[PDB]
């Protein structure tokens, strides 16, 4: 239909709470969290939604402890050589891209970025975007940032500056469906948490207490129904 | 406290849908909206909330029949004079400000703002923003162009901008709790609908149900005891 969500982004969260809650380490919550993303991606690949954004790692992560953080960064890295790599290589043909301060990452993370960019580079099947170290005010302030820099250099007058401009120095400048219309948060906060922001002023939200490690298909295919009930 | 927020603000909605179920006009929906504010601006004083921003008017609003916005700019013409009069000059001391794209009310509104900014310009009680003819992708680009014109004019280079030049140049930059700590918005809908958006990082959100017509103090400390539970 056309009731089916071109973009849907998704705010992962509630690992701790679960292992927590199941007697069991923090890295274990989140590599039970990240083994479900294939078959959401896959799902939403089924239901021919778009583009799919997860949302892996904001700036203020970079807060918690580097062996927190460490381990996030090897789960991802293995995410991209295991599964995402499957995901490219399958007949769902799915094109993979990472936004964020990737410069930010470690080297070996940054490689598996580029080795699945690469892989998954004339593919036509959906987007998968993995936002990584990404914020939404940081997105806006490295918009506002490079056509002040245009501005600079006479490429561009002041009064150019429109919503569309603006859009195409944020860093879904890589999407024709940049702003999602459905944004789903598992574990129960009603909040953005420094996400998209330019992004959002028309998406419809999905807030459901699951915690991410317990969130499958059938919890994408609920907010999917949420959102053809809007 | 300090699980007291210091910038609350609303979304109001459900006004139609209110008259319809009442068998009233909408003009009528709108009015007994209205009249629902200074008792929420109060509370809301007497709570101690440093700044109450209330949403009034998006840009995309000026798409509703002419009759039915020429209505609402009459009512807000009204609430300025009676309403907003009063609470300035009570002991409350409010202070008054309007954000938004103040051009493109007439001149009648326009008038009535200065006046109930002029009023209470020296008060030192909660801060009360009318936000009217305001939405956020607009106060985003709106910052970005003022910040481009000083990088035009040497005042300013590509690499001072920050969060906080940014931030500095929103309509918001009348307070310093630009940011709400809590987002109500009534009649149910789950979406920003472009109200602010850089200004939400962190903002916990409130949903209710009830349409606004029916909004009253006691649904304001209904969303502060959620607030205080989060
Ligand atoms: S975060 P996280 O998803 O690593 O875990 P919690 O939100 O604290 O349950
Ligand atoms: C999805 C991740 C990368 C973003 C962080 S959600 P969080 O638990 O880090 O943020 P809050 O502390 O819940 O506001
Ligand atoms: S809008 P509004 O508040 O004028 O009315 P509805 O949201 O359509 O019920
Ligand atoms: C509070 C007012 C001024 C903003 C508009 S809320 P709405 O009913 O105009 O917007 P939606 O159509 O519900 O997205
Ligand atoms: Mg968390
Ligand atoms: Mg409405």
């Not at 239909?1 to 709470?17: L, M, Q, S, Y």
């Not at 953080?69 to 293995?78: G, K, T």
């Not at 859009?167 to 998209?196: C, V, W, Y």
Request: charged fraction near 25%; proline fraction near 4%; glycine fraction near 6%.
């Amino acid at each position: 239909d056309e009731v089916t969500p071109n973009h849907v982004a998704i705010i992962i969260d509630g690992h701790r709470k679960w292992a927590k809650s199941r007697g069991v380490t923090v890295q274990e919550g989140h590599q039970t969290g990240v083994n479900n993303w294939k078959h959401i991606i896959s799902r939403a690949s089924q239901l021919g939604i778009k583009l799919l954004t997860i949302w892996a790692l904001s700036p203020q992560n970079f807060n918690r402890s580097k062996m927190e953080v460490d381990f996030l960064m090897r789960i991802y890295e293995d995410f991209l050589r295991s599964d995402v790599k499957e995901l490219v290589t399958s007949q769902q043909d799915i094109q993979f891209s990472a936004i964020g301060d990737k410069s930010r990452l470690p080297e070996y993370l940054q490689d598996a970025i580029s080795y699945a960019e690469g892989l998954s580079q004339a593919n036509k099947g959906m987007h998968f975007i993995l936002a990584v170290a990404y914020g939404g005010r940081e997105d806006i302030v490295e918009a506002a940032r490079k056509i002040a820099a245009k501005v600079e250099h006479g490429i561009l007058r002041p009064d150019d500056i429109d919503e569309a401009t603006f859009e195409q120095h944020l860093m879904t400048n890589i999407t024709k469906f940049p702003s999602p219309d459905l944004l789903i948060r598992a574990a129960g906060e009603q909040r953005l948490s420094n996400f998209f922001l330019w992004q959002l002023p028309f998406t419809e939200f999905y807030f459901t207490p699951k915690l991410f490690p317990d969130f499958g298909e059938a919890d994408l295919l609920d907010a999917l129904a949420s959102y053809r009930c809007r």
